[PDB]
Design an enzyme around this catalytic site. Sequence first.
Site, PDB file in Angstrom:
ATOM      1  N   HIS A  11      -0.583   2.393   5.880  1.00  0.00           N
ATOM      2  CA  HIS A  11      -0.716   3.726   5.336  1.00  0.00           C
ATOM      3  C   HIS A  11      -2.115   4.007   4.798  1.00  0.00           C
ATOM      4  O   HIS A  11      -2.535   5.180   4.697  1.00  0.00           O
ATOM      5  CB  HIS A  11       0.384   4.036   4.310  1.00  0.00           C
ATOM      6  CG  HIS A  11       0.064   3.631   2.908  1.00  0.00           C
ATOM      7  ND1 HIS A  11       0.515   2.447   2.355  1.00  0.00           N
ATOM      8  CD2 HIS A  11      -0.618   4.271   1.928  1.00  0.00           C
ATOM      9  CE1 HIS A  11       0.102   2.367   1.099  1.00  0.00           C
ATOM     10  NE2 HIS A  11      -0.577   3.469   0.810  1.00  0.00           N
TER      11      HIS A  11
ATOM     12  N   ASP B  23       4.490  -1.609   6.789  1.00  0.00           N
ATOM     13  CA  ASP B  23       3.272  -1.096   6.201  1.00  0.00           C
ATOM     14  C   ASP B  23       2.242  -2.273   6.108  1.00  0.00           C
ATOM     15  O   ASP B  23       2.024  -2.849   5.015  1.00  0.00           O
ATOM     16  CB  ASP B  23       3.533  -0.505   4.815  1.00  0.00           C
ATOM     17  CG  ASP B  23       2.352   0.290   4.297  1.00  0.00           C
ATOM     18  OD1 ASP B  23       1.410   0.585   5.107  1.00  0.00           O
ATOM     19  OD2 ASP B  23       2.337   0.604   3.085  1.00  0.00           O
TER      20      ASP B  23
ATOM     21  N   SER C  33      -2.872   0.237  -3.600  1.00  0.00           N
ATOM     22  CA  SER C  33      -2.223   0.142  -2.294  1.00  0.00           C
ATOM     23  C   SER C  33      -3.112  -0.534  -1.322  1.00  0.00           C
ATOM     24  O   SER C  33      -4.303  -0.258  -1.329  1.00  0.00           O
ATOM     25  CB  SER C  33      -1.904   1.540  -1.753  1.00  0.00           C
ATOM     26  OG  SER C  33      -1.165   2.243  -2.736  1.00  0.00           O
ATOM     27  N   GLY C  34      -2.515  -1.411  -0.487  1.00  0.00           N
ATOM     28  CA  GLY C  34      -3.245  -2.199   0.472  1.00  0.00           C
ATOM     29  C   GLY C  34      -3.745  -3.514  -0.108  1.00  0.00           C
ATOM     30  O   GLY C  34      -4.081  -4.460   0.651  1.00  0.00           O
TER      31      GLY C  34
HETATM   32  C1  LIG Z   1       9.616   6.082   1.607  1.00  0.00           C
HETATM   33  N1  LIG Z   1       8.472   6.521   0.739  1.00  0.00           N
HETATM   34  C2  LIG Z   1       7.220   5.723   1.022  1.00  0.00           C
HETATM   35  C3  LIG Z   1       5.937   6.286   0.382  1.00  0.00           C
HETATM   36  C4  LIG Z   1       6.181   6.797  -1.020  1.00  0.00           C
HETATM   37  N2  LIG Z   1       5.178   7.109  -1.889  1.00  0.00           N
HETATM   38  C5  LIG Z   1       5.747   7.579  -3.020  1.00  0.00           C
HETATM   39  C6  LIG Z   1       5.045   8.006  -4.261  1.00  0.00           C
HETATM   40  O1  LIG Z   1       5.665   8.470  -5.186  1.00  0.00           O
HETATM   41  N3  LIG Z   1       3.757   7.785  -4.307  1.00  0.00           N
HETATM   42  C7  LIG Z   1       2.847   8.322  -5.321  1.00  0.00           C
HETATM   43  C8  LIG Z   1       2.674   9.863  -5.208  1.00  0.00           C
HETATM   44  C9  LIG Z   1       1.956  10.242  -3.864  1.00  0.00           C
HETATM   45  C10 LIG Z   1       1.676  11.779  -3.808  1.00  0.00           C
HETATM   46  O2  LIG Z   1       0.656  12.129  -4.403  1.00  0.00           O
HETATM   47  N4  LIG Z   1       2.488  12.688  -3.164  1.00  0.00           N
HETATM   48  C11 LIG Z   1       2.104  14.134  -3.197  1.00  0.00           C
HETATM   49  C12 LIG Z   1       3.750  12.303  -2.453  1.00  0.00           C
HETATM   50  C13 LIG Z   1       0.626   9.470  -3.622  1.00  0.00           C
HETATM   51  C14 LIG Z   1       0.760   7.966  -3.915  1.00  0.00           C
HETATM   52  C15 LIG Z   1       1.452   7.635  -5.260  1.00  0.00           C
HETATM   53  N5  LIG Z   1       1.565   6.167  -5.226  1.00  0.00           N
HETATM   54  C16 LIG Z   1       1.638   5.531  -6.358  1.00  0.00           C
HETATM   55  O3  LIG Z   1       1.529   6.149  -7.418  1.00  0.00           O
HETATM   56  C17 LIG Z   1       1.985   4.048  -6.276  1.00  0.00           C
HETATM   57  C18 LIG Z   1       1.801   3.201  -5.221  1.00  0.00           C
HETATM   58  C19 LIG Z   1       2.376   1.924  -5.768  1.00  0.00           C
HETATM   59  C20 LIG Z   1       2.517   0.626  -5.234  1.00  0.00           C
HETATM   60  C21 LIG Z   1       3.157  -0.327  -6.037  1.00  0.00           C
HETATM   61 CL1  LIG Z   1       3.431  -1.965  -5.448  1.00  0.00          CL
HETATM   62  C22 LIG Z   1       3.634  -0.044  -7.345  1.00  0.00           C
HETATM   63  C23 LIG Z   1       3.506   1.223  -7.868  1.00  0.00           C
HETATM   64  C24 LIG Z   1       2.911   2.189  -7.053  1.00  0.00           C
HETATM   65  N6  LIG Z   1       2.673   3.491  -7.409  1.00  0.00           N
HETATM   66  S1  LIG Z   1       7.441   7.584  -3.095  1.00  0.00           S
HETATM   67  C25 LIG Z   1       7.465   7.003  -1.496  1.00  0.00           C
HETATM   68  C26 LIG Z   1       8.763   6.723  -0.727  1.00  0.00           C
END
Ligand SMILES: CN1CCc2nc(C(=O)N[C@@H]3C[C@@H](C(=O)N(C)C)CC[C@@H]3NC(=O)c3cc4cc(Cl)ccc4[nH]3)sc2C1
Lengths: 233, 54
Positions: free
Chosen positions: A42, A88, A185-186
């Site tokens: 991703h 991923d 991430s990553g």
């Molecule tokens: C099946 N889906 C896969 C991707 C996903 N991202 C989601 C999300 O809420 N992401 C945030 C908002 C998302 C966003 O801004 N949106 C408008 C959807 C951008 C990424 C954000 N990611 C994180 O905050 C994040 C990444 C991360 C990694 C790990 Cl190991 C622990 C905690 C953790 N928290 S929910 C979801 C469910």
Amino acid sequence: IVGGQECKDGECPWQALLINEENEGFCGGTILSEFYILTAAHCLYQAKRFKVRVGDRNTEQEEGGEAVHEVEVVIKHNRFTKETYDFDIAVLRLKTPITFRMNVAPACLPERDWAESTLMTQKTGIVSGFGRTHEKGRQSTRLKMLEVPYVDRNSCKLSSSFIITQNMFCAGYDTKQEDACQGDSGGPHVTRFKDTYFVTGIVSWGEGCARKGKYGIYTKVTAFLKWIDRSMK
Amino acid sequence: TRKLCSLDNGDCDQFCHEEQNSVVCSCARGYTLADNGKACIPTGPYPCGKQTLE
Ligand SMILES: CN1CCc2nc(C(=O)N[C@@H]3C[C@@H](C(=O)N(C)C)CC[C@@H]3NC(=O)c3cc4cc(Cl)ccc4[nH]3)sc2C1
Ligand SMILES: [Ca+2]
Ligand SMILES: [Ca+2]
């Protein structure tokens, strides 16, 4: 990283940082060898052109050990899907080899069965990165690290609004305020065993950061060890 | 009852595999198995999995 501590000198040498055209970090990676970075699929969509920085611990300062490497080949898992973030995982081949040195060195790839039976049954793993220091916050200018409990796979499935595939596992804390976060991430999730650190996960996604009843979701590296082997030739 | 690789990783530094009814140790790339068949020794500079001390 929400909570945890800074990586001190030499502590997280397998950390890579993917940087966009503005020299700003948007994702992490793990150094696997002089030529190859492990990261999340991703992350490839987060920038049209990007490079890999290694040796960095403080983005506000040039402390000498840093080096940027151009990417030569991107090897994305063909089954990656944006909708669930299943598979991923990506490997990057660099144009020029990384020179190992203080703060720059590879994490070990374990063997599948041992890793699953012995590493992923340990109490904790370690996640690190320059990502956000709280859900709504800005990214960290310091490399951070955090000990995260492995989480029972059923609890994780019950905790979660979205499907947890067998290519994923969960780590972190139910309510304690410590977690990975956006921008990590990553990056690496490694597990220590007798003072040697093995890669066990790739930072993938979470429902926000450090929310109560929510965990960090990581790519399960042990599901992809043959695939990484192949990708590295 | 924990035997072999389930008893303290079989005394191995790294990978433990059970063959027949015996422990067999091995090591990540860049390490060599020592003469005792259990410890792992780095074959060069910056071995994988080690935090850097210089
Ligand atoms: C099946 N889906 C896969 C991707 C996903 N991202 C989601 C999300 O809420 N992401 C945030 C908002 C998302 C966003 O801004 N949106 C408008 C959807 C951008 C990424 C954000 N990611 C994180 O905050 C994040 C990444 C991360 C990694 C790990 Cl190991 C622990 C905690 C953790 N928290 S929910 C979801 C469910
Ligand atoms: Ca710096
Ligand atoms: Ca939580």
